């Protein structure tokens, strides 16, 4: 809708604000899963090296 300039150029960037910040929120939640996925590598306690136990 701005190839043919039919919305504002402002309302686009404002939605592109919301696009880019919400994808910056997923990265701030995919890391938050990666915080809590790594608790489930910290459960099931992985032998951090090899060798004899």
């Amino acid at each position: 809708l701005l190839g043919t300039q039919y919305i504002s150029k402002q309302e686009y960037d404002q939605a592109l604000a919301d696009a880019q910040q919400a994808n910056a929120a997923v990265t701030a939640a995919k890391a938050a899963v990666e915080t809590a996925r790594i608790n489930l590598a910290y459960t099931k306690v992985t032998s951090p090296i090899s060798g004899r136990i």
């Binding site: 809708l1 043919t4 039919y6 919305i7």
Partner: protein, 49 residues
């Protein structure tokens, strides 16, 4: 008064056209903001019609 009425009607009615010729260009832009706005989905079919 009759001659100047028509001569000042037609000088109005030229500008009346260039008003409502722009009012088409407004509404033809507003229609095409809908047909592009409905083909992608932001505006509905009744906001088109």
């Amino acid at each position: 008064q009759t001659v100047r009425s028509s001569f000042n009607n037609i000088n109005a009615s030229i500008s009346s056209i260039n008003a409502y010729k722009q009012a088409v260009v407004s509404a033809q832009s507003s229609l095409d903001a809908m047909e592009a706005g409905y083909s992608v989905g932001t505006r509905t079919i009744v906001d088109v019609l």
